[PDB]
Amino acid sequence: MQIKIKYLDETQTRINKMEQGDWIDLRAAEDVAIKKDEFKLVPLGVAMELPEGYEAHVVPRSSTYKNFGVIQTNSMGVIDESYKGDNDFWFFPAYALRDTKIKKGDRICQFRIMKKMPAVDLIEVDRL
Amino acid sequence: MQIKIKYLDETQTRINQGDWIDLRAAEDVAIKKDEFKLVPLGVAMELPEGYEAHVVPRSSTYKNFGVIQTNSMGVIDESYKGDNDFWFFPAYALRDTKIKKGDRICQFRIMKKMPAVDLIEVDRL
Amino acid sequence: MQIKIKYLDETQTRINKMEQGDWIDLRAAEDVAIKKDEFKLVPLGVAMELPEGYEAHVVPRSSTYKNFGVIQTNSMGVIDESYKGDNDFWFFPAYALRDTKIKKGDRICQFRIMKKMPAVDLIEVDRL
Ligand SMILES: O=c1ccn([C@H]2C[C@H](O)[C@@H](COP(=O)(O)OP(=O)(O)O)O2)c(=O)[nH]1
Ligand SMILES: O=c1ccn([C@H]2C[C@H](O)[C@@H](COP(=O)(O)OP(=O)(O)O)O2)c(=O)[nH]1
């Protein structure tokens, strides 16, 4: 199956090929400084069309906290197959636990795709 | 396949493919900066056999409410299916905040449970 | 399908799993004290060889916040099949929101396996 990827501009680092199944590192599109106890949506400089029936999950890297002192505010980001527009760029929602500087090109998070959940009928009941 | 849902009361907003599903606050919940509260979602559910639920914030949850989910991602097992097994969102407030009854606060999907696997102890890898 | 598990030493409480595919709790390998607003990588005292083509995901137990006042700084840890060396021990990255103590043996996080994402073609495009 395939992913189509548009970059914000020619200066964004092209990302890893995916012929092995490993999660794929995504990078800051520009310098971002965040003060302690402040929040920033860090641009990742990438828009994607994911295979039909799939979604992507985004979490921080293992060394993200050590190096940058940030947590991801939504825990795990979900990118649906439908977020496939030419302006549908990806962002890492960063809350800083300490004063920090993130530089353009720094790897800041990682993503993989997964099959979206199957067809389900929700049915209300009065008692389990 | 089917999920059976019981709602806490008649006032809870009935929920609603493949997309993750929005869950909502069952009552008003005020949380001060640096304080924690379990936010009731006013739903109990009987998931399909051999499936579990995963619960994460919505993308806009932090912008709108200034809360983070303290367990990162909640796992609701197939076996949490009793009549009193209502779901909760564990919220830590990074600023003073006010959640209102009915506000969408998190979202869930189901996923097949891990395969049968045997843990074997070895003294070296 | 199996997982090979090596323990740090004899004093580590062996980890049992449920026949059903429940997530599996892991424990702290030693007594760890963490101050408010400090970070510690909490050793779990286990190294594992996961089945081929699988990865593990590590999240906190629902009760970890209430019992120990810590969040997991990477949201959800990804353990690849490749992290199967004799000194590839697993850790829970903990940030304390209050002064806390975690005891040796305490069940603090939980894991399951999942198949790795399938081989996919990343293909750059000028517009979506
Ligand atoms: O974010 C979550 C996570 C879990 N639960 C439900 C399912 C869970 O079984 C119960 C509380 O479980 P527990 O007995 O505290 O521990 P365990 O998670 O091993 O069941 O709450 C939630 O409502 N929200
Ligand atoms: O929550 C976690 C996340 C990962 N690891 C392990 C697996 C990982 O391989 C190693 C850190 O190595 P890395 O090379 O910084 O990251 P990765 O292997 O994720 O690229 O720590 C943990 O013990 N706990």
Q: Per residue, what are the HEC states of chain B? A: CEEEEEECCCCCCCCCCCCCEEEECCCCEEECCCCEEEEEEEEEEECCCCEEEEEEECCCHHHHHCEEECCCCEEEECCCCCCCCEEEEEEEECCCEEECCCCEEEEEEEEECCCCCEEEECCCC
Give the CATH number for residue A68.
2.70.40.10
In a domain, A122, yes or no: no
Q: Which residues of C touch B80 (CB under 8 A)?
A: none
> Measured between alpha carbons, how far is C76 from A61 in angstroms, rounded to an integer?
9
Measured between CA atoms, how close is B69 to chain A, in angstroms?
7
Q: Which domain holds residue B109?
A: 1-113
Q: Which residue of C has its CA nearest to B114?
A: C21
Q: What residues contact residue B73 under an 8 Å CB cut-off, 6+ apart?
A: A75, A76, B54, B55, B56, C59, C75, C76
How long, in residues, is chain A?
A: 128
Could you identify the atom of ligand 1 that is nearest to the CA of residue B41? Answer: 23
Cα(B48) to centroid of ligand 2, in Å? Answer: 33
* β-strand pairing of C89-96 with C39-49: antiparallel
Amino acid at C26: L
In a domain, C124, yes or no: no
CA distances from A102 to A34, A109, A117, C53, C110 (A): 8, 12, 35, 33, 31
At residue A113, the 3 state secondary structure works out as: strand
> Measured between alpha carbons, how far is A100 from A67 in angstroms, rounded to an integer?
9
In a domain, A96, yes or no: yes
In a domain, B122, yes or no: no
- Cβ atoms C76, A59 nearer than 8 A: yes
- Cβ atoms A116, B21 nearer than 8 A: no
CB contact under 8 A, C2 and B90: no
- How many domains in chain A? 1
> Measured between alpha carbons, how far is A96 from A114 in angstroms, rounded to an integer?
29
- Residue C93 Cβ inside 6 Å of ligand 2? The answer reads yes
- Cβ atoms C109, C102 nearer than 8 A: no
- Cβ atoms B66, B97 nearer than 8 A: yes
Beta bridge partners of A72: A94
- Cβ atoms C105, C13 nearer than 8 A: yes
- Cβ atoms A28, A108 nearer than 8 A: yes
Q: What residues contact residue C95 under an 8 Å CB cut-off, 6+ apart?
A: A65, A71, A97, C37, C38, C39, C70, C71, C72, C73
Q: Which residues of B touch C61 (CB under 8 A)?
A: 71
Write out the two tokens for A37.
């106890």
Write out the two tokens for A78.
């979900």
**Which protein residue has the closest C-alpha to ligand 1 atom 8?**
B76
Percent of chain A as helix, strand, coil, to the nearest 5: 5, 50, 45
A109: left (phi over 0), alpha (psi -120 to 50) or beta: beta
> Measured between alpha carbons, how far is B46 from B52 in angstroms, rounded to an integer?
10
Per-residue 3-state assignment (H helix, E strand, C coil) for chain C: CEEEEEECCCCCCCCCCCCCCCCEEEECCCCEEECCCCEEEEEEEEEEECCCCEEEEEEECCCHHHHHCEEECCCCEEEECCCCCCCCEEEEEEEECCCEEECCCCEEEEEEEEECCCCEEEEECCCC
Resolution in A: 1.9
In a domain, A127, yes or no: no
If one counts every other C-beta atom within 10 angstroms of the C-beta of residue C1, the result is 12
In a domain, A30, yes or no: yes
Residue bearing tokens 């396949």: B1
- Is A22 annotated in the active site? no
Residue bearing tokens 């995916």: A18
> Measured between alpha carbons, how far is B17 from B65 in angstroms, rounded to an integer?
27
CB contact under 8 A, A116 and B19: yes
- Cβ atoms A5, C125 nearer than 8 A: yes
Q: What residues contact residue A26 under an 8 Å CB cut-off, 6+ apart?
A: A15, A44, A46, A58, A90, A92, A107, A108, A109, A110, A111
Write out the two tokens for B116.
């049968």
Q: In Å, how far from its chain's centre is CA A110?
A: 6
Q: In Å, how far from its chain's centre is CA B73?
A: 8
- Residue C95 Cβ inside 6 Å of ligand 2? The answer reads no
CB contact under 8 A, C74 and A64: yes
In a domain, C87, yes or no: yes
Q: Dihedral through CA C108, CA C114, CA A28, CA A102, nearest 10?
A: 20
In a domain, C123, yes or no: no
Short-list A72, A37, C90, CA closest to B68: A72
Write out the two tokens for A20.
């092995």
